[PDB]
Symmetry: C3
Subunit: 314 residues, 3 copies
């Protein structure tokens, strides 16, 4: 019987039932550092074109919102779009033999414009259904075979996390004062370092960075706080882990990868015009969770209340 | 007494107290599909004007951030604003009889500019207090009677949700592999379908889509995960519900509806100029919550501890 | 013994163990009101320049996302940047005596461009390492000594919070119907008022607004819901508190303050060009948390189960 009582007490200390768990409040501020030199040859409208230039912080990212930030790793640029009438891009759905194939007003999910009910030539006696939209229609083409900002794995992200427990009135930040800021996060060498190379994060998660960077993806950074408020056993430090949140469906219907359509509006020769930039990139989700533990007398009284009857039966 | 013990055991199985609840981690990636053809007549500065064009994905929305995305359903465009001196728009607060009514430097909450202390004609011997701001002052006028992007109810939103329970080390996504992607969500016909028509969501919540689309609103999509990790009773699927989070105050002081002031900056004839686009739309909040349940021995020991003393009293 | 039983019952009522706690769902919609007149003298490239104009809502803020909104309090504008070759800005790392000091291709964390391996004059026989980037390189200079939008403390923010408890099926909003909207939040005078002056929030947190506004910071607004669902003791109102989430590291390596690099792209004389606006401001994080309490029979049965054995021992 005594060993059952003792296994009860040990169950208390091991489960930490004497402490009252408190939820975790987290705020995140991130600063991304690095630049990328882009020199590549991109085929546009069947003609070879040269993409060159340097991309600094303002070019490939924007400030974090909703505990998540994004890094553009690749892109496809269509310029000079203007509202008008224009044959749709040749695809399995758009090709037409005659005007009967196109219904005036028909909207297709792959199509970016409303059909005009006419079947017209796109190029060299190959006819698509004419549509009304921003034109010329953006190409239906694959992403660049090497991601233009393939240096995205070399950039470094600095994460600054502030956590507060209101029930215990305890506030602490991810970066303790006096810590040597110059470090690169490592699983064993620098567990508390807040500077993470993106390629390091992809190596930890086992996913090759380049492949994800070609068509875009969603990565996730987990910050764990297992915190104890008792003065005789106190420790409130974060544990960094990395997980790939992207589904990797690899199906055209499921919209694989992470990419969005950017629209820049300008006026030229007294004409309303748009430049459409298809943006491919890796969005990093920062997930912070924690429990605050302090000795609660009432919780210990309820636990004792259970283990007294559980105790007498032994 | 035996029926009290048995009602205790049944209370355990029914409340699932033997399992330890775990918090839910959710990440959301959404892709919106559809286009809207806009043809309408809008009165601008007392003169009839024609608004026409096609709006594709890049025009009426932007990528989701903070587990929420927005769809512009209506708009009001003021163009050519430039910094300068200019009579404010005629309202109950702005109309002045003489220069004494305007105090130089006075800032009014409805006014977008600082008064210059002068009372000047706006149009046809009707005087407003002259202000310093981006001018001409945007009209104080109602939204278009039919929302310009009234097709907003026909668009379809694809929601992709990844949930993880860290305590149980269990990860699953909203879309199971192999599910037929071609579907439209229905309460009974397609409960697991991740494609939702916006008008479907507004019909479920009982709110007419057009009315909300005229002046904007805030809609909310709820995803519930009641998940059980035990191998003998395992089920971890989402439940979709829809709720209107917008307050619908319908009071000018409470800023009714959802709308924001967009600023596009350009330079013309060596002059700094701005175009102000008042954006009306429906912001969709995706709310995901869940509990992870697995058999915990210590929890069962504490419960047993209570029900043994509760038991002996019977 | 009777006093131990009674201290148990009092422990129940005081800890509210008879009620089952439910998590809190929060959605936030905020509308910011006010304008700022900016008249200041800013030194640019060693030459005095005059910054003047009026900033309305669209100029200094954008809609809240992820339960947080931002207000630009200060800025530094570099205009006319274009891709090319150009000497880096003179700093401790950039100054070069000869071409040997610069390595072709070297990327420096403080530098915004890739070195070309050449050491060239910046101004008056003072040589920096030549780099390839958007040029001229933005100045490495301090923020304006008075924040250009120093009126940021006078603006007013309206916060509208909707909370829902799903387990109890109870929904309520921050603003009750019929409340006089005209109010300014005060700790004692107006505890339920949803209109907060920014300078009021900084006075509550004890941080001078101007200092934070010069280089930017992160502020946090806490909304507490302690809600009871029982009809005989029902109260579900918010408690507003204010806390400064910014770390205030004041170290160049830790990127002190809150600021981000904004990029506006334009084309001039058939040349791709960029204007880089360094944005300093105060980001307000709205944190809402709550517990829903209703009488649960099973919870009371487990508590009774503990306190019966705890009871008999006395
Ligand atoms: C949130 O705060 C903002 C911060 C920045 C911007 C500007 C912006 O849209 N930049 C985009 N990046 C580029 N171009 C564009 N657009 N980067 C390129 C720079 C040169 C040449 C490029 N060529 C092709 C594609 C991208 C290019 C981005 C979508 C961030 C990748 C807007 C913000 O919101 C108002
Ligand atoms: C987050 O990523 C971004 C994605 C896109 C944009 C461009 C943008 O502001 N588009 C806006 N939409 C339109 N015009 C504007 N501005 N749509 C119209 C298209 C033609 C004619 C229109 N005419 C009147 C009103 C809107 C029009 C929008 C505010 C989204 C409704 C910026 C982003 O942040 C950098
Ligand atoms: C999210 O919805 C958007 C709402 C607005 C904008 C426009 C914008 O970027 N405005 C910026 N504010 C200014 N200029 C810029 N850029 N304000 C100035 C107005 C005159 C003169 C100024 N001069 C210097 C610095 C700022 C100035 C801001 C970054 C908000 C401070 C973009 C949005 O995303 C698509
Ligand atoms: C990252 O930097 C290292 C060292 O400069 C270089 O060897 C490597 O090729 C870079 N990676 C990419 C993708 O450019
Ligand atoms: C939180 O703890 C600090 C510790 O010094 C104390 O000064 C402060 O008053 C506490 N907060 C409250 C609300 O009691
Ligand atoms: C920080 O660490 C780096 C390398 O680990 C070292 O070069 C540097 O001197 C350290 N800084 C301090 C202040 O110790
Ligand atoms: C949505 O589409 C249907 C079928 O094309 C059409 O009958 C309906 O009028 C559309 N709704 C709007 C608001 O355009
Ligand atoms: C989570 O479960 C999987 C199941 O195969 C296992 O391989 C993995 O090691 C587990 N994670 C941890 C941290 O133990
Ligand atoms: C999916 O369902 C649609 C209609 O419900 C049907 O036309 C289509 O053939 C289905 N796809 C598969 C692969 O069964
Ligand atoms: C805020 O407004 C008051 C009253 O108009 C004024 O005295 C004060 O100087 C203003 N503050 C700033 C920073 O402009
Ligand atoms: C929530 O409570 C209201 C109170 O009238 C009730 O009408 C509604 O049916 C309840 N919801 C559910 C899902 O039972
Ligand atoms: C609201 O309060 C203000 C000042 O506190 C007062 O001037 C106004 O008349 C009040 N409104 C109502 C409807 O009572």
């Amino acid at each position: 019987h005594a060993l059952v009582f003792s296994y009860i007490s040990f169950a208390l200390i091991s489960d930490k039932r004497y402490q009252k768990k408190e939820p975790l409040i987290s705020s995140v501020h991130t600063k991304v550092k690095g630049i990328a030199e882009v020199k590549a040859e991109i085929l546009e409208n069947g003609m070879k074109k040269m993409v060159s230039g340097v991309f600094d912080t303002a070019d490939y990212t924007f400030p974090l919102q909703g505990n998540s930030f994004f890094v553009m790793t690749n892109f496809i640029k269509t310029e000079g779009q203007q509202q008008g009438l224009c044959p749709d891009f040749p695809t399995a759905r758009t090709i037409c033999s005659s005007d009967r194939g196109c219904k005036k007003g028909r909207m297709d999910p792959q199509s970016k414009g409303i059909q005009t009910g006419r079947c017209v030539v796109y190029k060299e006696r190959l006819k698509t259904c004419e549509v009304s939209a921003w034109c010329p229609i953006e190409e239906v083409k694959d992403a660049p075979r090497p991601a233009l900002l393939n240096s995205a794995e070399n950039f470094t992200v600095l994460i600054k996390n502030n956590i507060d427990f209101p029930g215990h009135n305890y506030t602490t930040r991810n970066i303790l004062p006096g810590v040597n800021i110059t470090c690169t996060f490592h699983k064993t060498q620098n567990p508390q370092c807040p500077i993470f190379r993106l390629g390091d994060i992809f190596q930890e998660t086992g996913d090759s960075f380049s492949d994800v960077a070609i068509q875009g993806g969603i990565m996730g950074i987990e910050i764990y706080w297992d915190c104890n408020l008792d003065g005789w056993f106190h420790h409130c430090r974060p544990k960094y882990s990395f997980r790939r949140l992207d589904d990797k469906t690899t199906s055209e219907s499921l919209y694989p990868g992470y990419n969005f359509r950017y629209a820049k509006y300008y006026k030229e020769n007294n004409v309303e015009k748009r430049t459409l930039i298809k943006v491919f990139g890796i969005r990093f989700d920062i997930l912070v969770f924690g429990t605050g533990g302090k000795f609660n007398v009432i919780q210990l009284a309820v636990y004792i209340g259970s283990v007294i009857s559980y105790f007498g039966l032994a």
